[PDB]
């Protein structure tokens, strides 16, 4: 149907109705022990998170018209470069700083200028990047909603119409972000990535899945 709602369902079935939150950290806390034991990774450090709060803090970048507000459960910070309803704030997310230490966005001259980091359950992406000048300012897109998810949270990517979506999973996963679900919808690719309990782990599981030709970036033809 439509994405709006594709990703509203995943999102409380991933925190609330079916836990996958809970599965993956098994799925990676078992990869560490298969790589501990091949000698390949020693003792990282992981991260994991509290059980889901009520109301979940999400942030909608290039969110256009807030459509996620209503949602039940999502306390939704939405952004964006040109904002359509008076309930966006204005951003060009490529200028914002991530800021430790911090409890909600800071502005200047109305400009959303610092978010607080490791602060959102989730970040969401929805047609964004492929607005991006370029391929490095696609990645630096992700290293941004890197910082500012909380361990665990999950980065929600929607993008229109194999391989390169092999590469963006072998990208993210460099910048420890590992794939949890892929459907494809009418004209759209629908995509989650969840931080890892541990980025080393991430790092190590893109070394391993690396194809000869692919680029470290995301990119769009
Ligand atoms: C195709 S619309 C998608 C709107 C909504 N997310 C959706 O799924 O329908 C792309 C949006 O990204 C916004 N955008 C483009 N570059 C941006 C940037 N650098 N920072 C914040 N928003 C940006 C545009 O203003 C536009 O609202």
Known sequence: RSRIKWAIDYITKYFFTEGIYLQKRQREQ???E???????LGEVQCRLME???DRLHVLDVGSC???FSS???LEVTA???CPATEDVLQADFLKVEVVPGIREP???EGSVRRLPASHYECVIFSLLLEYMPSAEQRLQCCLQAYDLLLPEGILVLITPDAHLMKNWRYSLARIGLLRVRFEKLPHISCMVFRKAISRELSQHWASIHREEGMCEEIRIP
Not at 34 to 40: C, D, I, L, N
Request: charged share 30%; aromatic share 8%; proline share 16%.
């Open 30 to 32: 078992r990869l560490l």
């Open 34 to 40: 298969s790589y501990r034991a091949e000698g390949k």
């Open 51 to 53: 059980e889901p709060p």
């Open 65 to 67: 018209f807030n459509p």
């Open 71 to 73: 949602a039940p459960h």
């Open 79 to 81: 952004l964006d470069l």
């Open 106 to 108: 800071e502005l200047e």
